[PDB]
Amino acid sequence: FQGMLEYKREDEQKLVKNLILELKPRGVAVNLIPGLPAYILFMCVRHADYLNDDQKVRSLLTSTINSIKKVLKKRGDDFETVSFWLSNTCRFLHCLKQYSGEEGFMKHNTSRQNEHCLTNFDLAEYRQVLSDLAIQIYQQLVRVLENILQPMIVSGMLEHETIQTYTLDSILRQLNSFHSVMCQHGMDPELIKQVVKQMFYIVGAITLNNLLLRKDMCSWSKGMQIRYNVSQLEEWLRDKNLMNSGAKETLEPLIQAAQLLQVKKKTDDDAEAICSMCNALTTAQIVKVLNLYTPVNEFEERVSVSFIRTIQMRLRDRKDSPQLLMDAKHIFPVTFPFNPSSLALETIQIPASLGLGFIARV
């Protein structure tokens, strides 16, 4: 057994139907072996390459890419399905690299993986197409994230009192559910990191925008509440070993506005402390918070106009962005760094549960 799979030309549509269109991401086999559809499809590409059959290679790659697009048009609003196919598209791309035969992708191969490289076809142009597809799938993934998270944020980060409708705990359970689905799917760790940064940004940007929009959100105690909430999100990062994901950093402007809500706002020293601390907020965002600041406790006092004027004067030369509200729909641009797999293709078994009886091991 050489780690290849053969199938008849006429069964190609049946092949992508069972491996892609109708393949359930919760299937027991694809859970035991994350990436299974990708590997099976790749072992199919290998046999077509071996036969030197250009029509068959062309046809299979096209049916594969088009089937993935078809699943995402149909079920693209379901996180599990999109996550599953971002992972498998990525893995398929990795395989085509790992086993391309190009010496640069061979650095981490075993001797036996090297024997499995493609020999007749340079598939570089397909790789580029696949990469672009993953970008689009990733963008869909983030939009699904945003759609589920956005109704949870104000209620859970701002309105619900966490220090004596959605709660912080709701948000944290969502984040967990997202994370564990991606882990189940075997998504690249480096890509999970980016999804997590993106999620933290959504949470942060929506919370901050509300501060910039509502007087009843700008008090000492809200600021206190926001810092407490953030520290829970940081603990979530810490527990997941995601402290170098960049996700903490996306919360920095929110943290500085929450700190802005809490500090002294009367003296020139207070004016100066604020300008030193708030290096991740624009002059516009700073001045907004100050203008909106409305005491909720007796120990809080109104920010005077002269104080605000003072703060504008100190930031006169800083040349900030005019930005006020943040785009909660911004997507940090993503990369898919090559991630070679240690799976031995010759060990791979096609589970009867996939209905692939019409393909043969070679």
Curated annotation (Swiss-Prot):
Residues 62-317 form the Dilute domain. Detected in melanocytes. It comes from the Eukaryota. The modification Phosphothreonine is found at T267. Changing R58H: Slightly reduces affinity for MLPH. May be a homodimer, which associates with multiple calmodulin or myosin light chains. Interacts with RIPL2, the interaction is required for its role in dendrite formation. Interacts with MLPH. Interacts with SYTL4. Interacts with MYRIP. Interacts with RAB10; mediates the transport to the plasma membrane of SLC2A4/GLUT4 storage vesicles. Interacts with FMR1; this interaction occurs in association with polyribosome. Belongs to the TRAFAC class myosin-kinesin ATPase superfamily. Myosin family. Processive actin-based motor that can move in large steps approximating the 36-nm pseudo-repeat of the actin filament. Can hydrolyze ATP in the presence of actin, which is essential for its function as a motor protein. Involved in melanosome transport. Also mediates the transport of vesicles to the plasma membrane. May also be required for some polarization process involved in dendrite formation. This is Unconventional myosin-Va. It comes from Mus musculus. The gene is Myo5a. The chain holds residues 1471 to 1853 of 1853 of the full protein.
